[PDB]
């Protein structure tokens, strides 16, 4: 196999759900305070998802008939805006938003200059998004995983508005049926039909992953869960990717 080297083995990647950001100050201010306290402990790439505004731009674009390659960058823009908001809240700590080309080619120098940077979790697929679904498949969870695994990062933690993955949507019509899953494999999730709090494409990129062995989904609405997850404590749903350790 001779797996590729780890480019940034000391990096921790944290993906913040766009729906967490959508809650506004009530959710953002505690998260910002938790992130502030984490800056001296970890070297962080903080990546934001898109949330509800992307649903609105999908509503308009689908009504206009636009293809999935048109909707992809329109959604990515909302993740970038969430990133600019979050970075502004951390500016006094030396944190700025960095653009995709900079993340791809200059992340090492930026994390030498400061303890954390913020970027968009969506990948720059743009009009080269894959066809099949009218909804862009490669979204924020998928982008953050592709980047974390390409860098060989020490981890990826996904910060959600729920405790983790359930057997049904815990806010949906089958909500009394929904049982919490403390641990699962990506392959098991991929064989289930039904909604998830993570992109289905995340499960596919986990199958070809070369470094990241597990990803934890934790509730960002509960202070302390992100901090615990970054220390490896089990406070949400662990997803095993199928990368086998030494």
């Amino acid at each position: 196999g001779k797996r590729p080297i780890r480019l940034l083995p000391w990096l921790q990647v944290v993906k913040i759900g766009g729906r967490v950001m959508d809650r506004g100050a009530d959710a953002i201010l505690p998260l910002v305070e938790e992130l502030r306290k984490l800056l001296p402990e970890h070297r962080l790439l903080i990546l934001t998802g898109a949330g509800v505004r992307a649903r609105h731009v999908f509503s308009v674009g689908l009504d206009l008939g636009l293809p999935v390659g048109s909707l992809a960058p329109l959604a990515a823009s909302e993740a970038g805006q969430n990133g600019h908001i979050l970075a502004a809240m951390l500016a006094s700590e030396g944190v700025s938003y960095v653009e995709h080309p900079t993340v791809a080619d200059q992340l090492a120098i930026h994390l030498s200059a400061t303890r954390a940077v913020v970027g968009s979790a969506f990948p720059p697929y743009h009009h080269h998004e894959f066809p099949g679904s009218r909804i862009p498949p490669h979204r924020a969870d998928t982008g953050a995983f592709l980047l974390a695994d390409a860098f060989g990062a020490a981890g990826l933690t996904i910060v959600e508005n729920v405790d983790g993955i359930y057997t049904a949507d815990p806010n949906g019509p089958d909500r009394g049926q929904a049982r919490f899953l403390p641990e699962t494999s990506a392959t098991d999730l991929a064989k289930s039909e039904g909604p998830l709090p993570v992109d289905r494409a995340l499960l596919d990129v986990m199958a070809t992953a070369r470094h990241i062995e597990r990803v934890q989904v934790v509730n960002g609405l509960v202070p302390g869960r992100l901090t615990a997850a970054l220390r490896g404590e089990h406070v949400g749903t662990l997803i095993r990717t199928g990368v086998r350790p030494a």
Partner: protein
């Protein structure tokens, strides 16, 4: 479905929800550039061969833009193979290799563009296509570090065939033509087999069943083709035969037609 049901689902469900996915699938289908044809000019198969291969195709491009709107994408070729070999030997991942390959396709686009500049054709779309009826572009997808790796190895699986195909699909173009250095698909690689037989027309499923998943096209492109909404077949032609591109644009069945179904 209905617009109101779709908007309700879009607000209240995860994008992963099968009910939302199905409602979005019922949306209207706009083609952005329906009268355009995407052509890929091969890197190893055409541009790397120099004048004898490129100059006749330049002439055909100039003749064709008179009656055909063209998006002309470039392949990468031997310099990208060299970069991939160096980087793979260092243990670098597919996402790093992807950016290296993009630079080579860009070099090829610049060379082809300079031969077409006096004809008005730029390297880049809407304004150019309206006025000079053609543009040149580099064929590599923009995925960079976010390239999905293959199941095995670090060579990027989505290279310039995929890039050109995806642009044809997402602009809703009428036709996708891959310009290579063989007459079409054969039952075996014609360069390494004595008695390979020519295949004028085949479906993706038939190709897979015959062991041809990775033959004249990047095999990931065949799966993209089966998922496509707008471009449901492609044509592969030999750019080294004079007039072959002109004839394919005129509707002649030169080469091989590969169909999604």
């Amino acid at each position: 479905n209905s617009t109101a049901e779709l908007e309700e689902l879009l607000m209240q469900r995860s994008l992963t929800d099968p009910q939302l996915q199905a409602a979005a699938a019922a949306a209207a289908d706009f083609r952005i550039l329906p009268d355009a044809t995407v052509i890929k000019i091969g890197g190893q198969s055409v541009i790397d061969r120099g004048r004898a291969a490129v100059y006749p195709l330049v002439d055909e491009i100039v003749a064709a833009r008179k009656n055909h709107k063209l998006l002309i994408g470039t392949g990468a070729g031997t310099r990208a193979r060299h970069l991939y070999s160096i980087a793979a030997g260092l243990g670098l991942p597919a996402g790093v290799l992807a950016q290296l390959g993009s630079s080579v396709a860009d070099q090829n686009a610049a060379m082809l563009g300079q031969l077409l500049a006096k004809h008005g054709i730029p390297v880049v779309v809407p304004l150019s296509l309206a006025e000079v009826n053609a543009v040149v572009f580099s064929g590599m997808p923009p995925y960079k570090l976010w390239m999905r790796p293959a199941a095995e190895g670090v060579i990027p699986p989505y290279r310039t065939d995929a890039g050109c195909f995806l642009l044809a699909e997402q602009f809703g173009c009428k036709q996708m033509i891959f310009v290579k250095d063989e007459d079409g698909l054969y039952t075996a690689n014609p360069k390494t087999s004595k008695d390979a037989t020519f295949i004028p027309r085949i479906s993706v499923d038939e190709m897979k069943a015959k062991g041809l998943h990775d033959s004249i096209l990047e095999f990931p492109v065949l799966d993209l083709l089966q998922s496509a909404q707008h471009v449901r077949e492609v044509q592969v032609v030999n750019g080294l035969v004079p007039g072959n591109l002109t004839r394919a644009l005129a509707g002649e069945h030169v080469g091989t037609i590969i169909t999604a179904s």
